Design a protein around this ligand. Structure first.
Ligand SMILES: Nc1ncnc2c1ncn2[C@@H]1O[C@H](COP(=O)(O)OP(=O)(O)OP(=O)(O)O)[C@@H](O)[C@H]1O
Ligand SMILES: Nc1ncnc2c1ncn2[C@@H]1O[C@H](COP(=O)(O)OP(=O)(O)OP(=O)(O)O)[C@@H](O)[C@H]1O
Ligand SMILES: [Mg+2]
Ligand SMILES: [Mg+2]
Ligand SMILES: [Zn+2]
Lengths: 42, 636, 650
DNA sequence: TTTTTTTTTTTTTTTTTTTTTTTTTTTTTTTTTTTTTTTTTTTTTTTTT
């Protein structure tokens, strides 16, 4: 028994003011993947 | 040395296409059906019989037996990875643990993004999500070992040992995976637990709290965490495998899961498990090095000889009119004579039926005191009945007196507090307590036995203890009546020398006297010389039954509650009033009371149980009365 | 650091000397055969007599005994080389082969009191009584770890730094890969050696009668762990050493010492015999020559200092041989031990017979009337008080399992004790239980007991029932009951007195010439070897322990060897013997078996029939017969007929 | 092709900063272990009519 140490495990966030760095990083990611150039004809 | 991916493929193949003909010569894929039941949450424990594995891969069995934790893990992984394809329908979410599991799976698929590479610490631990337990039934090719001889060369190996259970703790929640939640993030942290103690986590390691560099303090929770049923048992060597001048050696067995609640103290068990170390951290140790405690990690607990958990001809001999005589004659067939004594002992084994009318319990147990002259097989019969009965305890004289009969409060080891341990009368609860040398028993024990034989409880109001113990045990006592020998110059109740209360508690006080008698002494001596000559009793008309068979028959007779008709009430009443009139009229008779009538009733219900009828008949009453009369025959 | 040594001169020379000593072929072949025998017995410790080294190499012997650690390392390397030379695969099986020492350690033979600090790092031979044993724990010597992430397997070695300096790097258990992948330990692939600690105390009979006992701690490692249990009297040979303390910036100069055992042997050098081919041949010829009166010859040779008591000596010979246990298939049991009770007048030598059996039989335990009370005679249950768990403690009768309890002054015991003896006497076991533990201890012991009658002197004008004070149930346990009277007849007086004066005249041959018997004052015993733990003409030379040369007497050493061989025999009741025994028992149960003015000393029960069978079996064993023939049965019947009846005078 | 001024340009150092390396260093609590009491639960010698 008291010989091995497994690590610690965590999951993703299961959901749940001034925006936190996680939300800002999400907004940066959505800007990078959603920023759009050109016009309707172009 | 070996590739565990190959070994997991090996165990997957074994699980998927091993078959036998267990149900009436029908190939049924023994482990596939169990995998189906496991996938539907209809079965928790899977026992892998290593005999089956050896049938088609003996070196896999040798690998399993030489590093058993590794292969328990490999088999658990193979089962985990096989379960999804054996699922035929949807689990009905039996309990709350299932709700947690399927919420976790739902949320993991919802935010999956499967092509992404996650961190190795960002999934669920395997043991958090199982709901099944995998155990090995060791190969029959491995001989059972002696607890003394399970040593450091067998650490990590699958061993079988046999012993008596002396001490087993209560089932308690041992945490397997600690689950925490955060005050900042909404993720769950998981701490699989291998040590005997753990330090609870403080900060959460979640990705969202590492990005935010917040506090993220995490809170240990029982709700999402995972526990397992856990028992700790001590198990002792059998008397016949202890070396000559020694005492038996104990081993600690850590029982957990579906293997809990099998072994009770006093049971003869055979335990298959892995012999493992527990590191001995903390103790400022005299010797340098990594010293550890050992224990057996249980995999398969099987209750043995008397603790053990029919063909048409079998029911034929049960329905035979001489079944009662054959069973009684199978009682210790190496003791010559004592035919009616063996009938009475058989009735004690079967017992009467308990009555609970309008909140006034009257026991069904039958108590018998053999009070005989020296050397008349009383201790041998007591010892035989102890060997035969399923929950029996044997006590002699004053070697197990006081708290060896009642309970005592003892320091718990698992947590450390004061737990109540039962003595002989508790270990023999709902069984037989064989009390040898009854006449030389300490008076405090005798008073305790008063209460046991009538109320079937033990009340204790000493300092550390204030309890009432259940002691629903038949009492088979043996004594010498007065000064070693029965002398006819003195009455009964003078060479019986039992108070009327204690005397009346016994349903049968059997008197044995060995008066010399030439032809009878020859018959006994021939029997005994044959036994010394062949290590068995001489051949007779009917071969005596095995103790396994005797146990099975007695057990079948046990759940056979027969009733007393209204029609017998006059016959039984007349028998009682008659017995009572000889007691009054005679000048050499013992104390007769209403307990004599209850003795008639419960003896006759035990006879009826032996015929496996549901109604007591006149012949049962007749035989009961004959037994009560024979019990005092030797004084004639 | 990280230095290696390039052919150390002293280690090389030592290993050469030790391998020369082990390679015994130009010499008598002793240790070469011993190494073969450990190979064949599948063991990895060789016990070396240090006298043999002194004979072959004084310089090695002294250097080994005074510098034990490195010398023993050299001698175990030499042993591994030699074992490989005989058998390389066997040498491959075991990582290290060990060397235990035995023989005569002159000044190194100490007691726990005398084991001072001048013996540190020397080999010593300590004798004492085991007071406490630890549990047998496994100590990891090689751990194997699997990394599931990388599929890598790691092994770590832990060297035995018990008495060496241990830096913390030497004791870390690997839990993580180099890049912090968790490792899982492979328990089945790791190697453990089991480890025990016992404490040896100065034996109470040898300690100075005034003061408190002195102890020494002993480390037992693999093969040596379960060799001793609490209450055992043992020799431990090993190295006396200081243990390291923990790391600290301050130290008192005070060191905790232990003895690291290289060998443990029991005091019972009487519980293990040594039979050479010549001994076996002598035994076989002695049994074949006179296979009829061999029993009488063995009996009359039993306690030579005691004159008379021919039947009592025959009975004691039967007790020392025993019967055969019947272990029935359904687990039932009939005992095969004989219990004898000697009642009699004062000064008829019954304590002398008990003392003879005590100094003659193996596993013989002495006990007196009130010196063993309650739990000191059968087992006891105590609580560990460290773990809080109940423990068993073996009393006199458990320790005499497969032996004899010689209970002297049996009549002066309490009735509580005498009724505790009942189960041991008949069923051969002790059943004890407290709440947390219940055991059934084997006490397969025979009871030889000596008692005085009530009134101290046996009244010949009363029945034996009222001279013996024992109840019938207890008397029934003793299968033979001898009334040993002091009949004051002048002729028997002349016989006894002539014998006694001859034994008071005898002087040991040459060893003595007019001198006194030393007291053995606790420094003289350590001067020589202990006869208890020490390492055959079938007859004795005649001088005047006997009056004339007319009938020879068996040698005591040969009698021990012969009885040890004959005890293993399992003679079978033949049908003629069984019929005769049954007929005699039925006759003996009857009143005609006793005339007028004769009385039963003990009741005749079925135990008497088993008594006849056990006595006949022991008689058959004496002849090494393998069957119980009619002569054995009639000898048993005459023993019983003699013992069970007594003429009462007016 | 003899004389003659800028030109470096190799050599002495010196500055001189910036960076990496070097050097220094007991006390104080805690805890197990042993050896003691101490209330309570027996249990083993005391006597009567
Ligand atoms: N039919 C029988 N009657 C009497 N004794 C028998 C019989 N068969 C066998 N025996 C023998 O009796 C011996 C045992 O004595 P037992 O166990 O009877 O003592 P017990 O009845 O307890 O007497 P006690 O009152 O002296 O304790 C056993 O060795 C057993 O073989
Ligand atoms: N044949 C014999 N008969 C009687 N005594 C003998 C005989 N031979 C020797 N003795 C001596 O008698 C002495 C006393 O014997 P012992 O002390 O053994 O008697 P005991 O029977 O134990 O007496 P008690 O019953 O008072 O204990 C011993 O010194 C012993 O040597
Ligand atoms: Mg008995
Ligand atoms: Mg004496
Ligand atoms: Zn968080």
């Amino acid at each position: 028994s008291g010989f091995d140490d497994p690590g610690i495990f965590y999951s993703d966030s299961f959901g749940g003011g001034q925006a936190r760095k996680s939300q800002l990083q999400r907004r940066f990611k959505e800007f990078l993947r959603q920023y759009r150039v050109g016009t309707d004809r172009t | 040395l070996k590739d565990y991916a190959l070994e997991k493929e090996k165990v997957k193949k074994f699980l998927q296409e091993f078959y036998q003909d267990d149900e009436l010569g029908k190939k049924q894929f023994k482990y596939g059906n169990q995998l189906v039941r496991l996938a539907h949450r209809e079965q928790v424990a899977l026992y892998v019989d290593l005999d089956d594995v050896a049938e088609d891969d003996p070196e896999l069995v040798d690998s399993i037996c030489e590093n058993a934790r590794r292969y328990a893990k490999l088999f658990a992984d193979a089962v985990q990875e096989l379960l999804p394809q054996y699922k035929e329908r949807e689990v009905v979410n039996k309990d709350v643990l299932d709700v947690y599991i399927e919420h976790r799976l739902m949320m993991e698929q919802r935010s999956r993004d499967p092509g992404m590479v996650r961190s190795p610490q960002n999934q669920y631990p395997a043991e958090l999500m199982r709901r099944f337990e995998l155990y090995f039934q060791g190969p029959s090719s491995n001989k059972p070992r002696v607890i003394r001889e399970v040593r450091a060369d067998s650490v990590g190996k699958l061993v079988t040992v046999r012993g008596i259970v002396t001490r087993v703790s209560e089932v308690k929640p041992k945490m397997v995976v600690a689950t925490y939640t955060c005050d900042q993030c909404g993720a769950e942290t998981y701490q699989p637990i291998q040590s005997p103690t753990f330090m609870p986590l403080i900060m959460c390691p979640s990705q969202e709290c590492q990005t935010n560099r917040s506090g993220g303090r995490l809170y240990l929770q029982t709700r999402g965490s995972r526990f397992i049923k856990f028992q700790e048992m001590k198990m002792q060597e059998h008397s016949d495998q202890v070396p000559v001048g020694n005492i038996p050696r104990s081993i600690t067995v850590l029982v957990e899961g579906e293997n809990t609640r099998i072994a009770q103290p006093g049971d003869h068990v055979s335990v298959t498990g892995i012999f493992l170390p527990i590191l001995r951290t903390g103790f400022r140790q005299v010797v340098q090095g990594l010293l550890s405690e050992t224990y057996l990690e249980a995999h398969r607990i099987v209750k043995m000889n008397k603790s053990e958990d029919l063909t048409r001809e079998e029911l034929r001999q049960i329905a035979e009119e001489d079944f009662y005589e054959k069973l009684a004659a199978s009682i210790a067939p190496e003791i010559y004579g004592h035919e009616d004594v063996k009938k009475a002992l058989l009735l004690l084994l079967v017992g009467g039926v308990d009555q609970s009318p309008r909140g006034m319990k009257i026991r069904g147990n039958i108590n018998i005191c053999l009070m005989g002259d020296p050397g008349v097989a009383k201790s041998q019969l007591l010892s035989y009945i102890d060997r035969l009965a399923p929950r029996s305890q044997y006590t002699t004289g004053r070697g197990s007196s006081g708290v060896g009969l009642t309970a005592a409060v003892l320091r718990d080891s698992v947590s450390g507090e004061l737990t109540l341990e039962g003595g002989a009368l508790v270990l023999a609860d709902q069984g037989v307590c064989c009390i040898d040398e009854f006449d030389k028993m300490a008076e405090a024990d005798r008073t305790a036995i008063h209460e046991v034989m009538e109320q079937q409880t033990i009340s204790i109001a000493k300092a550390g203890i204030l309890t009432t113990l259940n002691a629903r045990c038949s009492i088979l006592a043996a004594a010498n009546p007065a000064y070693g020998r029965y002398n006819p110059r003195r009455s009964l109740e003078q060479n019986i020398q039992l108070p009327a209360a204690l005397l009346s508690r016994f349903d049968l006080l059997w008197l044995i006297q060995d008066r010399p008698d030439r032809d009878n002494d020859l018959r006994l001596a021939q029997h005994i010389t044959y036994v010394h000559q062949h290590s068995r009793q001489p051949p007779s008309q009917f071969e005596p039954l095995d103790m396994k068979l005797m146990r099975r028959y007695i057990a079948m007779c046990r759940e056979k509650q027969p009733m007393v008709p209204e029609s017998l009430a006059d016959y039984i009443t007349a028998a009682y009033v008659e017995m009572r009139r000889e007691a009054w009229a005679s000048k050499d008779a013992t104390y007769t009371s209403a307990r004599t009538l209850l003795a008639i009733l419960r003896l006759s219900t035990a006879l009826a149980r032996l015929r496996m009828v549901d109604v007591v008949e006149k012949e049962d009453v007749n035989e009961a009365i004959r037994l009560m009369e024979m019990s005092k025959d030797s004084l004639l | 650091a990280g230095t290696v040594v390039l052919d150390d001169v002293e280690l090389r020379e030592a290993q050469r000397d030790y391998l020369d000593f082990l390679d015994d072929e130009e010499d008598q072949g002793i240790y070469q055969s011993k190494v073969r025998e450990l190979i064949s017995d599948n063991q990895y410790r060789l016990i070396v007599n240090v006298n043999d080294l002194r004979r072959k190499n004084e310089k090695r012997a002294n250097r080994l005994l005074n510098n034990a650690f490195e010398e023993l390392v050299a001698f175990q390397r030499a042993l591994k080389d030699f074992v490989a030379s005989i058998d390389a695969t066997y040498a491959k099986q075991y990582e290290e082969f060990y060397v235990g020492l035995e023989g005569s350690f002159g000044s190194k033979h100490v007691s726990p009191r005398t084991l001072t600090s001048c013996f540190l790092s020397c080999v010593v031979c300590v004798e004492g009584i085991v007071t406490k044993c630890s549990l047998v724990r496994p100590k990891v010597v090689r751990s194997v770890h699997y990394c599931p992430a990388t599929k890598k397997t790691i092994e770590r070695r832990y060297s035995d730094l018990t008495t060496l300096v241990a830096f913390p790097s030497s004791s870390v258990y690997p839990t993580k890969d180099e890049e912090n992948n968790p490792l899982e330990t492979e328990y089945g692939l790791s190697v453990y050696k089991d480890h025990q600690t016992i404490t040896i105390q100065e034996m109470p009979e040898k300690a100075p009668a005034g003061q408190l006992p002195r102890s020494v701690d002993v480390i037992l490692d693999d093969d040596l762990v379960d060799k001793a249990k609490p209450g055992d009297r043992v020799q431990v040979v090993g190295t006396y050493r200081c243990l390291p303390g923990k790391k600290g910036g301050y130290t008192s100069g005070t060191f905790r010492t232990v003895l690291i055992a290289c060998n443990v042997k029991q005091m019972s050098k009487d519980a293990q015999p040594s039979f050479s081919a010549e001994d076996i041949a002598k035994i076989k010829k002695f049994s074949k020559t006179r296979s009829k009166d061999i029993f009488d010859q063995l009996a009359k040779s039993l306690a030579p200092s005691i004159h008379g008591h021919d039947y009592v000596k025959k009975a004691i010979l039967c007790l020392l041989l025993g019967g055969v246990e019947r272990d029935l298939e359904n687990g039932s049991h009939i005992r095969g031990d004989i219990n004898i009770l000697l009642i009699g007048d004062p000064s008829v030598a019954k304590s002398q017979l008990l003392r003879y059996v005590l100094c003659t039989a193996p596993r013989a335990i002495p006990t007196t009337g009130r010196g063993s009370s309650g739990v000191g005679l059968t087992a006891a249950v105590t609580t560990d008080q460290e773990t809080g768990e109940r423990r068993l403690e073996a009393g006199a009768m458990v320790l005499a399992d497969r032996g004899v309890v010689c209970i002297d002054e049996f009549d002066k015991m309490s009735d509580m004790d005498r009724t505790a003896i009942h189960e041991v006497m008949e069923q051969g076991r002790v059943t004890i239980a407290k709440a947390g533990i219940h055991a059934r201890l084997n006490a397969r012991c025979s009871v030889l007991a000596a008692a005085n009658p009530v009134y101290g002197r046996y009244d010949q004008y009363k029945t034996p029932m009222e001279n013996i004070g024992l109840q019938d149930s207890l008397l029934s346990r003793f299968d033979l009951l001898f009334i040993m009277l002091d009949q004051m007849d002048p002729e028997q007086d002349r016989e006894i007195s002539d014998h006694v004066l001859r034994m008071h005249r005898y002087r040991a041959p040459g060893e003595q010439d007019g001198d006194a018997m030393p007291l053995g004052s606790a420094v003289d015993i350590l001067a020589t070897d202990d006869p208890n733990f020490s390492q055959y003409e079938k007859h004795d030379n005649l001088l005047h322990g006997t009056k004339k040369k007319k009938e020879k007497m068996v040698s005591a050493a040969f009698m021990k060897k012969y009885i040890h061989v004959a005890k293993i025999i399992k003679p079978v009741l033949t049908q003629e013997s069984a019929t005769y025994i049954a007929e005699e028992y039925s006759r003996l149960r009857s009143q005609d078996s006793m005339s007028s003015d004769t009385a039963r000393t003990s009741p005749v029960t079925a135990r008497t029939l088993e008594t006849l069978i056990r006595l006949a079996t022991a008689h058959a064993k004496a002849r090494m017969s393998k069957t119980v023939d009619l002569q054995d049965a009639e000898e048993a019947v005459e023993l019983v007929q003699y013992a069970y009846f007594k003429k009462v005078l007016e």
